[PDB]
Amino acid sequence: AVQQNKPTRSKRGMRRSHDALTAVTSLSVDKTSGEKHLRHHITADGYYRGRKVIAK
Amino acid sequence: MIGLVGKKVGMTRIFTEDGVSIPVTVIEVEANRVTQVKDLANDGYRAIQVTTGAKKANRVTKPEAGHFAKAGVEAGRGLWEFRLAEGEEFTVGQSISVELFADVKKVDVTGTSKGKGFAGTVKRWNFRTQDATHGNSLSHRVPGSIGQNQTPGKVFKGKKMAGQMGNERVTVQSLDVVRVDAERNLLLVKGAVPGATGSDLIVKPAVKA
Amino acid sequence: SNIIKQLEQEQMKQDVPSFRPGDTVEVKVWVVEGSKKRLQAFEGVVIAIRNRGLHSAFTVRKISNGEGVERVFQTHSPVVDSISVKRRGAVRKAKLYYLRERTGKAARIKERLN
Amino acid sequence: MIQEQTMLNVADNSGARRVMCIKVLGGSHRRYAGVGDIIKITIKEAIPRGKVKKGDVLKAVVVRTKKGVRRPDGSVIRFDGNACVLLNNNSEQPIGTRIFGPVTRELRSEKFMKIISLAPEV
Amino acid sequence: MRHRKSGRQLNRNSSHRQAMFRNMAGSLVRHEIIKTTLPKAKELRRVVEPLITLAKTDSVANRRLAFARTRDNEIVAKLFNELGPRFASRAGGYTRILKCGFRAGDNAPMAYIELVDRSE
Amino acid sequence: XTXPFXX
RNA sequence: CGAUGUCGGCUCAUCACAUCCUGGGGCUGAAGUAGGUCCCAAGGGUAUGGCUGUUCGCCAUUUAAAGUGGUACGCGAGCUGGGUUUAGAACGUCGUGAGACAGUUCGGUCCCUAUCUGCCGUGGGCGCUGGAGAACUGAGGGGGGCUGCUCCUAGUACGAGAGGACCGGAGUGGACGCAUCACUGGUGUUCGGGUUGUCAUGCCAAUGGCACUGCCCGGUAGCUAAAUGCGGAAGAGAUAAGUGCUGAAAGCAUCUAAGCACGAAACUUGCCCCGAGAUGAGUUCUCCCUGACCCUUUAAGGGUCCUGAAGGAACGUUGAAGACGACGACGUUGAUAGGCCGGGUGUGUAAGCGCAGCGAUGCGUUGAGCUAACCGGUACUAAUGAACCGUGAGGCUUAACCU
RNA sequence: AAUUCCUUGUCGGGUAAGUUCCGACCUGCACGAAUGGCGUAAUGAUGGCCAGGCUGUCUCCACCCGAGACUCAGUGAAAU
RNA sequence: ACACAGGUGGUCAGGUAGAGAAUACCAAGGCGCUUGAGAGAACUCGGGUGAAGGAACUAGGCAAAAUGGUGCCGUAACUUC
RNA sequence: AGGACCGAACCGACUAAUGUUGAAAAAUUAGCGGAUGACUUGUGGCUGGGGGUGAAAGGCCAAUCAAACCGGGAGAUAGCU
Ligand SMILES: [Mg+2]
Ligand SMILES: [Mg+2]
Ligand SMILES: [Mg+2]
Ligand SMILES: [Mg+2]
Ligand SMILES: [Mg+2]
Ligand SMILES: [Mg+2]
Ligand SMILES: [Mg+2]
Ligand SMILES: [Mg+2]
Ligand SMILES: [Mg+2]
Ligand SMILES: [Mg+2]
Ligand SMILES: [Mg+2]
Ligand SMILES: [Mg+2]
Ligand SMILES: [Mg+2]
Ligand SMILES: [Mg+2]
Ligand SMILES: [Mg+2]
Ligand SMILES: [Mg+2]
Ligand SMILES: [Mg+2]
Ligand SMILES: [Mg+2]
Ligand SMILES: [Mg+2]
Ligand SMILES: [Mg+2]
Ligand SMILES: [Mg+2]
Ligand SMILES: [Mg+2]
Ligand SMILES: [Mg+2]
Ligand SMILES: [Mg+2]
Ligand SMILES: [Mg+2]
Ligand SMILES: [Mg+2]
Ligand SMILES: [Mg+2]
Ligand SMILES: [Mg+2]
Ligand SMILES: [Mg+2]
Ligand SMILES: [Mg+2]
Ligand SMILES: [Mg+2]
Ligand SMILES: [Mg+2]
Ligand SMILES: [Mg+2]
Ligand SMILES: [Mg+2]
Ligand SMILES: [Mg+2]
Ligand SMILES: [Mg+2]
Ligand SMILES: [Mg+2]
Ligand SMILES: [Mg+2]
Ligand SMILES: [Mg+2]
Ligand SMILES: [Mg+2]
Ligand SMILES: [Mg+2]
Ligand SMILES: [Mg+2]
Ligand SMILES: [Mg+2]
Ligand SMILES: [Mg+2]
Ligand SMILES: [Mg+2]
Ligand SMILES: [Mg+2]
Ligand SMILES: [Mg+2]
Ligand SMILES: [Mg+2]
Ligand SMILES: [Mg+2]
Ligand SMILES: [Mg+2]
Ligand SMILES: [Mg+2]
Ligand SMILES: [Mg+2]
């Protein structure tokens, strides 16, 4: 099954009406190191909720 | 008359003196509490609205809490209405126990049927299956043809097709009330009722004779 | 479920004697013979026990006039007046479904005795 | 749970030995006979000087099945094989005169009282 | 269709799962902390904790069993000798997960899973 | 050329 | 004719009614039972097999009935490919022959990832005039609508007798539909056990890997039908054919012209589901927001500063919710998930040790050991205050109250 | 009848029922003797027919283990 | 045409089990096949199990299921023996 | 002894499903026939286009064949589109 007419550029546009990404708004900052990090995730230097977890 | 809101506990059985096993659904019916009356003057129809159970205060909202507060009953897991019937009369804050049913004899029991997800034609509509064998190519559970030819030249609305099945409102009519025990918040009705254990049920006295 | 336990065990028998698959039991069952209620005996080998509280049940197999008759009792039905152990059987297996494929002589199971 | 093509043993001195069910009477599209229902059979095997010969086509009540019978309390009576008792077409009612093997009380059925009155067990 | 079913299938067949988690409970135990996808990490807790639990009672049976699962004596040595008596008095939750972002090469949700004291 | 398309 | 593929089958259907069954009715050469014929009626229902490619037909056996038609002789981007069916081959028949048959026979490639319409599901957006959370009313829409048999009445009415009812009531079935997992069962590659071959963990003992889960015996939770519960209705309204009352036109007669009584599974209701995007955007209850400044073509104007509630949503733990979204639960003032404790359940007496035996193996400790998704508990682990979105009292007109 | 139009010929057998099968008849539309006639043990991925076992072929479908389908990331077509 | 599930002659032949160069498991040796991560819908593909029934399927038992070894005993018509 | 039997290699290609913008311009999987013979295979040679070769299908002669491919006559001719 293939199209009988070439869809319109407008239609392409409408089909993509919903693929905008959503930026996060959910970063937080570790109280004890001040690195940004997703909520509920650890930081790059391995801090989580202030205590230094991990250590690598 | 009015009906109560309960919870589906599970099924078991009551063995009877003369060796019958009655299969029963065990429905919890905590006191229903009237959260609002409605009348002609104010609403254009008479009915009680009721709550039951309890709700984590943190998860009660400002609006909800307002509305509850007014009737002076504590929050409950939800609200449900029952159409009053010329004669029936209640007052805000009134408490209704399962003993409402200490007779009736049969009840209609509404719940939300277990959710099967995206059902295909066979399961959802009892569509009878094509050959497993004898040449059939990729077409065993598939739904067959869905129309005629140019005439319609379309598919008719209401066509039995595959889609969500389950997880919708279902009433089951005229089940024998088996037991009513308010001290224990029990309603035993004979037979299985809609919805998985745990979910809400609406028991109204059966409408059919 | 805590309620349902309450409902179920207040309906359970507190005297079901002991028996295990292999044992030969005689179940005495109430029945209406025409115009008469009356106890009636069913005796055979316990080939299976379904252990579930009020819903507990057992399948008793017996060879009546030439072929098998299995009947699954519901241990707590009033219909079941009494259960009795005529002979303690020695097997190892919870479900004795294989005795079906055995006739007369192969069917026999060692006595437990102990 | 007998249906078309199902083979059954005979439970009487009718002379029939193996009958095949060619019809489940009692309802349009009705698919199974059991408990104590009335099927229509042909005869695939009969003894040499019986009251029915092979090839004969009449009816028969079913009196024993592997699927068995439930009871008001939940329990089940199962049988190792499927058995019926021949009846004659324009009368139902049993051709044989003796009955073999156990039968179940479901046969209380007025017209099958004979069958219970004969017949060893239950 | 899943209703009330436990157990993640990790796009694997039964044996393979079993293999892998055997190979991974051992890892976690040895190193006391490892990094893995968040899904696996969460399953791992189901395999690895009851080994610990088992180990809180030293007997021959229990070691052999802990060898049946795991099949590595170094590891069944550590449970029992170190780990069991470490968690002697704590009722489960021997393990802990720390979500830690996203795998470059495929964007898989990663996490650390660790014994609750490490020190190592 | 051999009956149905295209046997 | 720069391609509109086909008989039958399978699957799925949808209309017509010249109606097969069920319902109502007139006549009958209708005693009853059972028929015949016509009128009304399309709500629902309306067979499996033997043979043949068949449709059909015949035959067997059911059934209340096995309706007749339309829909590209409905339905091949849905399947099938037996019929038809190119190329191989053969018989008969024709032809000197190549060959041919609208004769027969054996064999013989069925592609297409769905843009649009349509359809089934499920979301995102905005709107409904300040914003919000709920519970609703119910315009509209959809579903459903079948029927056997037995018993009573009554062996009565009727009938010479055989036989055998109407009206009404009571049961219990067939087929169909929905729900459910309590029971009976299926499955249960996540539970337990037995066992073959081989490799390994040094060996023994004990285990593990691989061989379809190696092959098997069982089986929890869940899912599920064959399992067990419930349904079709009664009632009401207006009618069809039809039966009539009163009654003229037409001194009589006349169901009709005025007026009045009845009358069916059809219709409108009553039952179940959806349902205010019902833009004609409805009702009710509750909740939240009470700063100023500048500019322009000065108007429902544009901007800035401060503000940022109700609520939404986010993140995490998740669910008998689920393709994804969505919906529901829970986030320490906590049982949401995992673990952990106890119980249950399943399997069916582990290991080790001891005793017996030459040994295989038995017995004791022992209904042992192990035991998933189960029940009852338990903060051990993970569910961090926060962020974002949404604002800051809400147009004009008239009316009614009101100062 | 690989041959028979009429034709599912007729009769018999098998089946509850058999336009096929087998045995028969002869009215051979339109068999026939190396364009070989009729038989024929064995052989056959050869055509037709019956039966035992066997079974999810089917009544009528359920559950389960896996690869796709679905979701996230990377790459990235097609016919029209 | 491709780092293509195709095609391509000869030589070598370990252990256990086995008749075997079949087959299963191994040794030496060589590999996990150049997108992965999750989900656990329909439907498709490829497998396992299935109550009662048992060819009722269908043009047709198509496809499945079933049979399956060794040694003894023992095997009908018919036959060119 | 045997164009002998069963069965791997090897040769083949009866059934089905898959695939059908394939992993593949004919295959994959499960089943299947031959398998000391008119067997099967490597290397090289010979036969050439109205010609070859053919246990005969109009088969095969470089993804083709009721007359190969290449270049030429050549802008064959086309009352057709
Ligand atoms: Mg669900
Ligand atoms: Mg079918
Ligand atoms: Mg195909
Ligand atoms: Mg297929
Ligand atoms: Mg769970
Ligand atoms: Mg994947
Ligand atoms: Mg065109
Ligand atoms: Mg076209
Ligand atoms: Mg009409
Ligand atoms: Mg006429
Ligand atoms: Mg057509
Ligand atoms: Mg096609
Ligand atoms: Mg043909
Ligand atoms: Mg498609
Ligand atoms: Mg189960
Ligand atoms: Mg050993
Ligand atoms: Mg291995
Ligand atoms: Mg394996
Ligand atoms: Mg008059
Ligand atoms: Mg509603
Ligand atoms: Mg436990
Ligand atoms: Mg719990
Ligand atoms: Mg302001
Ligand atoms: Mg003949
Ligand atoms: Mg037949
Ligand atoms: Mg000739
Ligand atoms: Mg001559
Ligand atoms: Mg010849
Ligand atoms: Mg040959
Ligand atoms: Mg799957
Ligand atoms: Mg992608
Ligand atoms: Mg590669
Ligand atoms: Mg290659
Ligand atoms: Mg090999
Ligand atoms: Mg890899
Ligand atoms: Mg199987
Ligand atoms: Mg079965
Ligand atoms: Mg069986
Ligand atoms: Mg059989
Ligand atoms: Mg048929
Ligand atoms: Mg047939
Ligand atoms: Mg086959
Ligand atoms: Mg097979
Ligand atoms: Mg040979
Ligand atoms: Mg092959
Ligand atoms: Mg061979
Ligand atoms: Mg050569
Ligand atoms: Mg070629
Ligand atoms: Mg030429
Ligand atoms: Mg040329
Ligand atoms: Mg020239
Ligand atoms: Mg030219």
UniProtKB/Swiss-Prot annotation, chain A:
GO terms for molecular function: structural constituent of ribosome. GO terms for biological process: cytoplasmic translation; response to radiation; response to reactive oxygen species; ribosomal large subunit assembly. One of its GO terms (cellular component) is cytosolic large ribosomal subunit. Keywords: Ribonucleoprotein, Ribosomal protein. It comes from the Bacteria. Residues 1-37 are annotated as: Disordered. InterPro entries: Ribosomal_bL32, Ribosomal_bL32_bact, Ribosomal_zn-bd. PANTHER family: 50S RIBOSOMAL PROTEIN L32 (PTHR35534), LARGE RIBOSOMAL SUBUNIT PROTEIN BL32 (PTHR35534:SF1). NCBIfam families: rpmF_bact. Belongs to the bacterial ribosomal protein bL32 family. Part of the 50S ribosomal subunit. Contacts L17. This is Large ribosomal subunit protein bL32. It comes from Escherichia coli (strain K12). The gene is rpmF.
Curated annotation (Swiss-Prot), chain C:
It comes from the Bacteria. Induction: Part of the rpsP-rimM-trmD-rplS operon. GO terms for cellular component: cytoplasm; cytosol; cytosolic large ribosomal subunit. It holds the Pfam family Ribosomal_L19. Keywords: Ribonucleoprotein, Ribosomal protein, RNA-binding, rRNA-binding. Disulfide bonds: none annotated. GO terms for biological process: cytoplasmic translation; ribosomal large subunit assembly. GO terms for molecular function: large ribosomal subunit rRNA binding; structural constituent of ribosome. Part of the 50S ribosomal subunit. Contacts L14. Forms two bridges to the 30S subunit in the 70S ribosome, contacting the 16S rRNA. In pre-50S ribosomal subunits interacts with RsfS, which may inhibit association with the 30S subunit. Belongs to the bacterial ribosomal protein bL19 family. This protein is located at the 30S-50S ribosomal subunit interface and may play a role in the structure and function of the aminoacyl-tRNA binding site. This is Large ribosomal subunit protein bL19. It comes from Escherichia coli (strain K12). The gene is rplS.
From Swiss-Prot, chain D:
CDD domains: Ribosomal_uL14. Disulfide bonds: none annotated. Belongs to the universal ribosomal protein uL14 family. GO terms for biological process: cytoplasmic translation. Part of the 50S ribosomal subunit. Forms a cluster with proteins L3 and L19. Forms two bridges to the 30S subunit in the 70S ribosome, contacting the 16S rRNA. In pre-50S ribosomal subunits interacts with RsfS, which may inhibit association with the 30S subunit. Changing residue 114 to A: Reduced RsfS binding. This is Large ribosomal subunit protein uL14. It comes from Escherichia coli (strain K12). One of its GO terms (molecular function) is large ribosomal subunit rRNA binding. InterPro entries: Ribosomal_uL14, Ribosomal_uL14_bac-type, Ribosomal_uL14_CS, Ribosomal_uL14_sf. Binds to 23S rRNA. Forms part of two intersubunit bridges in the 70S ribosome. In the 3.5 A resolved structures L14 and L19 interact and together make contact with the 16S rRNA in bridges B5 and B8. One of its GO terms (cellular component) is cytosol. HAMAP family: Ribosomal_uL14. Keywords: Ribonucleoprotein, Ribosomal protein, RNA-binding, rRNA-binding.
Curated annotation (Swiss-Prot), chain E:
GO terms for molecular function: structural constituent of ribosome. One of its GO terms (cellular component) is cytosol. The keyword Amino-acid biosynthesis does not apply. InterPro entries: Ribosomal_bL17, Ribosomal_bL17_CS, Ribosomal_bL17_sf. It holds the Pfam family Ribosomal_L17. GO terms for biological process: cytoplasmic translation; ribosomal large subunit assembly. Keywords: Ribonucleoprotein, Ribosomal protein. Belongs to the bacterial ribosomal protein bL17 family. Requires L15 for assembly into the 50S subunit. Part of the 50S ribosomal subunit. Contacts protein L32. This is Large ribosomal subunit protein bL17. It comes from Escherichia coli (strain K12).
